[PDB]
Design a protein around this motif. Structure first.
Motif, short mmCIF file in Angstrom:
data_model
loop_
_atom_site.label_atom_id
_atom_site.label_comp_id
_atom_site.label_asym_id
_atom_site.label_seq_id
_atom_site.Cartn_x
_atom_site.Cartn_y
_atom_site.Cartn_z
N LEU A 109 -21.40 -34.12 9.20
CA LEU A 109 -21.76 -35.32 8.50
C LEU A 109 -20.55 -36.09 7.96
CD1 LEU A 109 -24.75 -33.86 6.43
CD2 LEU A 109 -24.98 -35.61 8.21
N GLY A 110 -19.36 -35.66 8.26
CA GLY A 110 -18.17 -36.39 7.78
C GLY A 110 -17.87 -36.20 6.29
N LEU A 111 -18.41 -35.15 5.68
CA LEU A 111 -18.17 -34.89 4.27
C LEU A 111 -16.88 -34.03 4.13
CD1 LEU A 111 -21.87 -34.21 3.21
CD2 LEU A 111 -20.50 -36.20 2.68
N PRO A 112 -16.16 -34.17 3.00
CA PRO A 112 -14.84 -33.58 2.96
C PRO A 112 -14.88 -32.12 2.62
CG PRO A 112 -15.29 -34.82 0.98
CD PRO A 112 -16.39 -35.12 1.89
N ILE A 113 -14.25 -31.34 3.47
CA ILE A 113 -14.02 -29.95 3.25
C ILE A 113 -12.58 -29.63 3.57
CG2 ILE A 113 -16.38 -29.26 3.76
CD1 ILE A 113 -15.08 -28.33 6.51
N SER A 114 -12.09 -28.54 3.03
CA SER A 114 -10.72 -28.18 3.22
C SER A 114 -10.54 -27.81 4.68
CB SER A 114 -10.39 -27.01 2.34
OG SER A 114 -9.10 -26.53 2.67
N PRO A 115 -9.42 -28.23 5.30
CA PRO A 115 -9.14 -27.77 6.68
C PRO A 115 -9.18 -26.24 6.77
CG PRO A 115 -7.55 -29.47 6.03
CD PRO A 115 -8.43 -29.23 4.83
N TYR A 116 -9.71 -25.70 7.85
CA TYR A 116 -9.90 -24.26 7.91
C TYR A 116 -10.01 -23.84 9.35
CZ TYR A 116 -14.63 -24.93 9.48
OH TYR A 116 -15.75 -25.29 10.18
N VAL A 117 -9.95 -22.53 9.56
CA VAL A 117 -10.18 -21.90 10.82
C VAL A 117 -11.13 -20.76 10.56
CG1 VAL A 117 -9.15 -20.46 12.64
CG2 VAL A 117 -7.99 -22.51 11.89
N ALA A 118 -12.12 -20.64 11.46
CA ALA A 118 -13.12 -19.56 11.43
C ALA A 118 -12.72 -18.55 12.45
CB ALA A 118 -14.49 -20.11 11.80
N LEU A 119 -12.93 -17.29 12.13
CA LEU A 119 -12.65 -16.20 13.04
C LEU A 119 -13.77 -15.16 13.00
CD1 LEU A 119 -8.99 -14.99 12.59
CD2 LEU A 119 -9.98 -16.02 14.67
N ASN A 120 -14.30 -14.79 14.16
CA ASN A 120 -15.19 -13.61 14.24
C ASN A 120 -14.44 -12.30 14.54
OD1 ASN A 120 -14.92 -13.19 17.16
ND2 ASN A 120 -16.09 -15.09 17.32
N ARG A 121 -15.18 -11.20 14.51
CA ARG A 121 -14.61 -9.87 14.77
C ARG A 121 -14.00 -9.73 16.16
NH1 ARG A 121 -17.61 -7.05 11.81
NH2 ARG A 121 -15.98 -6.44 10.32
N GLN A 122 -14.65 -10.34 17.15
CA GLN A 122 -14.21 -10.27 18.53
C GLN A 122 -12.82 -10.87 18.69
OE1 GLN A 122 -13.01 -12.16 21.36
NE2 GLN A 122 -14.91 -13.03 22.18
N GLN A 123 -12.60 -12.04 18.12
CA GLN A 123 -11.31 -12.69 18.23
C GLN A 123 -10.27 -11.87 17.49
OE1 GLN A 123 -13.08 -16.14 16.40
NE2 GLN A 123 -12.24 -17.47 17.98
N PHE A 124 -10.66 -11.30 16.36
CA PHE A 124 -9.76 -10.49 15.56
C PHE A 124 -9.29 -9.26 16.33
CE2 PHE A 124 -9.49 -7.12 12.10
CZ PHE A 124 -8.21 -7.48 11.70
N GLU A 125 -10.19 -8.69 17.12
CA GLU A 125 -9.90 -7.47 17.85
C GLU A 125 -9.05 -7.75 19.11
OE1 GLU A 125 -13.64 -4.81 16.09
OE2 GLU A 125 -13.72 -5.41 18.21
N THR A 126 -9.27 -8.91 19.74
CA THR A 126 -8.54 -9.32 20.97
C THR A 126 -7.27 -10.16 20.70
OG1 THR A 126 -9.87 -11.33 21.42
CG2 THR A 126 -10.68 -9.22 22.36
N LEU A 127 -6.84 -10.30 19.45
CA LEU A 127 -5.64 -11.11 19.16
C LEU A 127 -4.61 -10.34 18.36
CD1 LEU A 127 -7.25 -14.56 18.29
CD2 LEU A 127 -5.87 -14.06 20.31
N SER A 128 -3.35 -10.60 18.71
CA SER A 128 -2.19 -10.02 18.06
C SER A 128 -1.87 -10.76 16.77
CB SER A 128 -0.96 -10.10 18.98
OG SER A 128 -0.58 -11.46 19.23
N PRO A 129 -1.32 -10.04 15.78
CA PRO A 129 -0.88 -10.80 14.64
C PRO A 129 0.37 -11.44 15.15
CG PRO A 129 -1.09 -8.49 14.10
CD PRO A 129 -1.08 -8.60 15.59
N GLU A 130 0.43 -12.75 15.14
CA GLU A 130 1.52 -13.49 15.75
C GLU A 130 0.77 -14.57 16.45
OE1 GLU A 130 5.21 -12.45 18.55
OE2 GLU A 130 3.86 -13.90 19.47
N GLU A 131 -0.24 -14.19 17.24
CA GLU A 131 -1.19 -15.20 17.70
C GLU A 131 -2.15 -15.63 16.56
OE1 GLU A 131 -3.82 -17.80 19.69
OE2 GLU A 131 -1.68 -17.61 19.26
#
Ligand SMILES: Nc1ncnc2c1ncn2[C@@H]1O[C@H](COP(=O)(O)OP(=O)(O)O)[C@@H](O)[C@H]1O
Ligand code: NA
Ligand code: NA
Lengths: 298, 289
Positions: A107-129
């Motif tokens: 709806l174009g309402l203001p929220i803080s910029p952010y990134v969402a992450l699920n468990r799958q991405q957490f498990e398949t990604l290196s800290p660095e990525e």
């Protein structure tokens, strides 16, 4: 015929003790307004029996799990009893910080910029990525479960530990750009927006422990800023399909722009709680407040 | 020893008769798999008494109001009985077509261009300014309540008003969507597995396999899964999708308690996937804990 009203209070959530106080105050406010109200400690009495017990209407003064999350509201819809506050969808949706944000963002309402992450991405990604995933947010960052496990991260090297902690509690996690503050809250009653309150927590988060915390009403905002905040809060509340009453939480950034944090669909009603404070500043007694909330059920 | 399972069926919604069939089939499928299951017609038995009656687990085979909208799920959460399908939030969110769309859109997922209108705007605006509000959507248009009752296809701008009036009978939020030339598909999901899609042709015709190329089926399967996770669904469900003339897929809706009759969509897809109906229902139940 006159209505028998149940004030649901206490319960079995972590917030039980605050809810006993809220319910006790609500109960006394309603009786002072001449309403045939009865306290019902839902720890001892099953909410599935409210209709059998003769109630016509329910005032919800529970907080947290089983109170403001859609579950109770579902039971009440099944029984076909009118009740205070928001319906099933809104009560539940407001517990989900990711989906709340998504709706506000579409709806174009203001929220803080952010990134969402699920468990799958957490498990398949290196800290660095992971660090690279959130690089565009700058520093510092807030890391939190989508539904406790929150951290402030000051340097990229601290990110991992914060993610690990957050995934203990949830399979969806949010990484948000840190906002300088200050924090505000805006109570809504029916269609009326009440005066905002500025909130100063003792530390970094307005968390469970903070709920020494200081509250200012009037908030100290300029008139123009208050009007902007009021209109924004109302939109944020209608966006999630809330009704009856509630509280919208908002934060400023360094630029003085407002950002939406969350909507609370069963606020504290103790003598020292936010909504009663705002109502008082608006010119309502506690008793008038609760009679009005009840009148907005149905 | 064994878990006692209630199959909730029938009920009091418009879809009662379909739900009696779904429940009857589910009941037989569970018994065939060795589960101690009992049919429970919720018209005659109050769901608030399921625990008192000794049930340990619930399979939900109700459809529509009071089945797939969050209310039943709330009762079950209160009783702390494990149950099949999505939880409160997702069950209820999927009935709100506006908010479903908004969530999908914020994630960058594809939906048909549309305009949303509340009662206030409707009351403040003339027929001519309404037409101008939706001019960018072209023609024809679908007009629907946000929550096929009150739906219209609008072919000419002059028909818009009547469609809005009809839609606002039923809801305070109304959607006006760009019409899509089709075809329509549905994608069943079971836990984390995506089943084979079905093409639906509007005497209704169903094709499984859908006729899509392998690469298109993979795209659709990934898209459907994202759409389902986006709304926080779990257990199982059905995602509905449509093509435009150019072959782009668009999300329509997610159904959180699908039909389970012998001739229903999910069973047809499960069959094509290689599961018997009995295996399908046992898998759904296993996903409830
Ligand atoms: N992006 C952010 N920047 C700075 N502070 C934040 C941010 N998000 C939340 N907070 C702080 O954390 C507190 C709690 O987080 P919130 O998102 O409101 O959820 P919860 O109620 O589950 O803790 C807020 O009241 C605020 O003090
Ligand atoms: Na809520
Ligand atoms: Na649903």
């Amino acid at each position: 015929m006159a209505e028998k009203v149940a004030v649901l209070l206490g319960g079995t959530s972590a917030e039980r003790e605050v809810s006993l106080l809220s319910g006790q105050a609500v109960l006394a406010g309603l009786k002072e307004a001449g309403i045939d109200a009865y306290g019902v400690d839902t720890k001892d009495f099953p909410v599935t029996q409210l209709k059998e017990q003769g109630f016509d209407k329910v005032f919800i003064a529970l907080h947290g799990r089983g109170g403001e999350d859609g579950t109770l509201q579902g039971v009440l819809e099944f029984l076909q009893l009118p009740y205070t506050g928001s319906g099933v969808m809104a009560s539940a949706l407001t517990m989900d910080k990711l989906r709340t944000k998504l709706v506000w963002q579409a709806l174009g309402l203001p929220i803080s910029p952010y990134v969402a992450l699920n468990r799958q991405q957490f498990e398949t990604l290196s800290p660095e990525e992971l660090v690279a995933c959130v690089a565009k947010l700058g520093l510092p960052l807030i890391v939190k479960p989508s539904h406790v496990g929150m951290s402030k991260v000051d340097h990229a090297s601290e990110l991992q530990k914060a993610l690990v902690e957050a995934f203990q509690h949830d399979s969806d996690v949010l990484i948000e750009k840190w906002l300088s503050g200050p924090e505000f809250t805006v109570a809504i009653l029916g269609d009326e927006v009440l005066p905002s309150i500025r909130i100063q927590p003792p530390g970094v988060f307005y968390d469970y422990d903070a709920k020494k915390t200081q509250y200012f009403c009037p908030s100290g905002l300029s008139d123009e800023s208050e009007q902007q905040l009021a209109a924004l809060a109302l939109q944020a509340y209608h966006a999630l399909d809330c009704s009856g009453w509630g509280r919208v939480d908002v934060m400023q950034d360094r630029d003085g722009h407002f950002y939406l944090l969350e909507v609370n669909t069963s606020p504290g009603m103790t003598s020292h709680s936010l909504v009663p404070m705002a109502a008082r500043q608006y010119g309502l007694s506690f008793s008038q407040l609760v009679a009005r909330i009840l009148m907005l059920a149905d």
